[PDB]
Amino acid sequence: KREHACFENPGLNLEKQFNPYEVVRS
Amino acid sequence: KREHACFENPGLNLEKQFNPYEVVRS
Amino acid sequence: SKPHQWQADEEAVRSATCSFSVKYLGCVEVFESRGMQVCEEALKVLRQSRRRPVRGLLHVSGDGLRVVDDETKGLIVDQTIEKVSFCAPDRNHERGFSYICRDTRRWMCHGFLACKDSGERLSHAVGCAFAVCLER
Amino acid sequence: SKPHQWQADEEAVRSATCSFSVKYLGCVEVFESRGMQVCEEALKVLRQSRRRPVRGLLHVSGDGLRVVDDETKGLIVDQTIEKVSFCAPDRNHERGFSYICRDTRRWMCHGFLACKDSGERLSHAVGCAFAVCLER
């Protein structure tokens, strides 16, 4: 058979946990 | 001043959680 | 423009009332995020193992893929859609179906035997969940 | 062939009886795993912030870097050595000291002001913990 009924997810997430001791850069 | 008292860790780990539903390849 | 059964299934996925009776065969690492052959080889591995298949219901929605064990009612698989990359039926088994998701940085293929549907019906349903994922 | 104080400190690190009084300034993301300038800029950021520094003891051993809060006795930092890549004193502050570790895939620099030691003494102690790490 040929390939059929196959689906890729366009919403697949390719791309941070909060640390109270962390200083954010500016 | 010049750099002094700096240390790199040669034991730094650069390089798996067990899943009871997982089948291992052979 | 879908087949009637698929258009109806899309309605059920979008209202979170879509489920299919399955045996969950487990999962196996795969080295690619997509590809029908990658899934078919994973399913071949899963069928070759001696581990007991688990009967349950596969619920498909934008909120996730949930596998609920028939015997225990335990929620034994709870998969967010945003981590699922690919799904496919099986040219070697009319009721086979699998999906590939993130494991960490690895890929895992989760394999199923549908009890009374074709694998391609399950695949289309999961593909509808992908659509909802992209919408959110 | 080390200075006497450093040879003694190495003994204390290896028997897990090495600790230093510090203020813990917190941590900031860094974009490189090593480099004295990377640490010195992190410490500059940490000193510029308004967050309260936490007084405690920094315990150094092969089992980890542990920061125990003086006021509460709470174990507020517990860092395995195998995730620490680099440590350095500070040319801008005689008592400044910091280390870089894994955050996930990111790097974080944890900054300290030693209460009654030079930063380079702390740096050497942590470097001894590196030695033990490689031995294990």
CATH number at residue C113: 2.30.29.30
- How would DSSP label each residue in A1-26? ----S-EE-TT--------TTBPPP-
Domain assignment of residue C23, given as a range: 1-136
C-alpha–C-alpha distance, residues C74 and C130, integer Å: 25
Phi/psi at C130 (5° precision): -55, -50
Q: Which residues of A1-26 are buried (b: 16+ CB within 10 A; e: fewer)?
A: eeeebbbbbebbeeeeeeeebbbeee
Question: Mind telling me how many Å the CA of C114 is from chain A's nearest CA?
Answer: 15
Integer angstrom CA distances of residue C111 from C70, C93, C121, C122: 17, 12, 15, 12
Resolution of this entry in Å?
2.0
Question: Which residue is listed with tokens 């899943």?
Answer: B19
> By three-state DSSP, how is residue B24 classified?
coil
Query: D43 near D90, Cβ under 8 Å?
Result: yes
Among chain A residues, the shortest Cα distance to D45 is held by A25
Beta-carbon separation of B17 and C108 below 8 A: no
Question: Encoding tokens for residue B10?
Answer: 């040669």
Question: Encoding tokens for residue D119?
Answer: 């930063």
Kind of pairing between the strands at A7-8 and D107-114: unpaired
CA A25 from centre of chain: 24
Question: Encoding tokens for residue C70?
Answer: 């028939």
Beta-carbon separation of A7 and C82 below 8 A: no
Which of B3, B5, B12 has the CB atom closest to D124's CB atom?
B5
Integer angstrom CA distances of residue C9 from C1, C42, C104, C111, D42: 13, 26, 32, 21, 54
Count Cα atoms within 13 angstroms, Cβ side, for D26: 21
C-alpha–C-alpha distance, residues D90 and C74, integer Å: 55
Question: Mind telling me how many Å the CA of B23 is from chain C's nearest CA?
Answer: 5
Question: Which residue is listed with tokens 């005689």?
Answer: D94
State the structure-solving technique: X-ray
Residues 6+ positions from A22 with CB-CB distance below 8 Å: D26, D27, D28, D29, D108
Which of B1, B5, B9 has the CB atom closest to D130's CB atom?
B9
Among chain A residues, the shortest Cα distance to D31 is held by A25
C-alpha–C-alpha distance, residues C53 and C37, integer Å: 22
Q: Is B14 on the interface with D (CB under 8 A)?
A: no
Chain A contact probe: residue of C2, C36, C92 with most A CBs at under 10 A: C36
Integer angstrom CA distances of residue C36 from C41, C94, C96, D71: 9, 14, 12, 60
Residues 6+ positions from C121 with CB-CB distance below 8 Å: C5, C6, C9, C20, C114
C-alpha–C-alpha distance, residues A21 and D79, integer Å: 14
C-alpha–C-alpha distance, residues D99 and D60, integer Å: 12
Q: Is A18 on the interface with D (CB under 8 A)?
A: no
Chain C contact probe: residue of A9, A13, A14, A15 with most C CBs at under 10 A: A9
The tally of domains found in chain D comes to 1
Q: Which long-range contacts (CB under 8 A, 24 or more apart) does A3-6 make?
A: A3/C36, A3/C88, A3/C91, A4/C89, A4/C120, A5/C88, A5/C89, A5/C119, A5/C120, A5/C123, A5/C124, A5/C127, A6/C36, A6/C86, A6/C87, A6/C88, A6/C89, A6/C123
For D80: left if phi > 0, alpha if psi spans -120 to 50, otherwise beta; the answer is: beta
Residue D99 β-bridge partners: D87, D110
Query: B11 near D134, Cβ under 8 Å?
Result: yes
Q: Which residues of D111-132 are buried (b: 16+ CB within 10 A; e: fewer)?
A: bbbbeebbbbbbbbbbbbbbbb
Among chain D residues, the shortest Cα distance to B8 is held by D86
C-alpha–C-alpha distance, residues D80 and D61, integer Å: 9
Among chain A residues, the shortest Cα distance to D48 is held by A23
